[PDB]
């Protein structure tokens, strides 16, 4: 109900550690725009 692309991530193997290291961990995502970005029709923002 979007008509947009999507991204997903899957466990291929699983995480393997030696003795004496933390068990769980984390991933972080960063987003940005590439040089070819364009905008039109200045309007008012819906946040204030």
């Amino acid at each position: 109900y979007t008509s947009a692309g999507n991204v997903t991530c899957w466990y291929q193997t699983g995480i393997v550690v030696p003795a004496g290291t933390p068990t769980s961990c984390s991933i972080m995502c960063f987003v940005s725009a590439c040089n070819d970005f364009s905008v039109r029709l200045l309007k008012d923002t819906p946040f204030i």
Binding site: Q12, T13, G14, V16, P18, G20, T21, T23
Partner: protein, 245 residues
């Protein structure tokens, strides 16, 4: 020191320090033009056959004998490359296979990754015949066993004879790569099309077989993860079919 590779609308990431085996020295290519000039005209898709297809990961535990896949028909449900298998009567293709592991410096183990042409397999009963389901299950892997198997119509899959009646320490004669958790975790194999005819039908013949076999089992200690994931990614190269017009 990381490279990012895009094929079509797919993107994966590898390390630029990769090592690549080109199977017998031969890169894939089109059968050039004039083996069968007059009424044998081929066509090529080059649309969404050249793209990365990623299977489900497998789970490497302490007692894992190994895994195998058959090519093609591991890709008979994979989007367009699978559609072309039903629409066309003859075809051919080469492949690029990436195999990756996710492990830490506190794990240890060793894998052989080998691509075997014409891997004809034996039955568990000496005066028997193998079934079609026991040879492959498509995009799901079959499993080797650690002892000798029984039951009707099953491949005899004891891992020391690799289902072919040879010694498994001698499979290095084929295009192969080693994965030692100590020094690397990835392997790329580029396979060309190998047959005794130029084209063929892709449903009743298995061109080659991909096998993954642990030679030193996975070991870990106190509170590391108890498994390691392995991931396989395939990109078809220079695919070509019979013309329809």
């Amino acid at each position: 020191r990381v490279r990012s590779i895009t094929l079509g609308n797919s993107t994966i990431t590898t390390q630029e320090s990769a090592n690549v085996v080109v199977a017998y020295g031969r890169w894939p290519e089109y059968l050039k033009d004039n083996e069968a000039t007059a009424e044998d005209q081929p066509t090529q898709p080059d649309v969404a056959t050249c793209r990365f297809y990623t299977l489900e990961s497998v789970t490497w535990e302490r007692d894992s004998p190994g895994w195998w896949w058959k090519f093609p028909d591991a890709l008979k449900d994979m989007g367009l490359f699978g559609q072309n298998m039903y629409y066309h009567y003859l075809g051919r293709a080469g492949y690029t296979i990436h195999v990756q592991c996710n492990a830490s410096k506190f794990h240890q183990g060793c894998l052989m990754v080998v691509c075997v042409p014409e891997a004809e397999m034996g039955c568990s009963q000496v005066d028997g015949t193998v079934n079609e389901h026991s040879l492959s299950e498509g995009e799901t892997a079959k499993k080797f066993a650690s002892t000798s198997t029984n039951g009707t119509n099953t491949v005899q899959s004891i891992v020391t004879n690799a289902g072919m009646g040879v010694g498994v320490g001698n499979l290095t004669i084929f295009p192969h790569q080693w994965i030692n958790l100590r020094t690397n975790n990835c392997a790329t194999i580029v396979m060309p099309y190998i047959n005794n005819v130029p084209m063929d039908n892709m449903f009743r013949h298995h061109n080659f077989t991909l096998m993954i076999i642990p030679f030193v089992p996975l070991d870990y200690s106190s509170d590391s993860s108890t498994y390691v994931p392995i991931t396989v990614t395939v990109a078809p190269m220079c695919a070509e079919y019979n013309g329809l017009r």
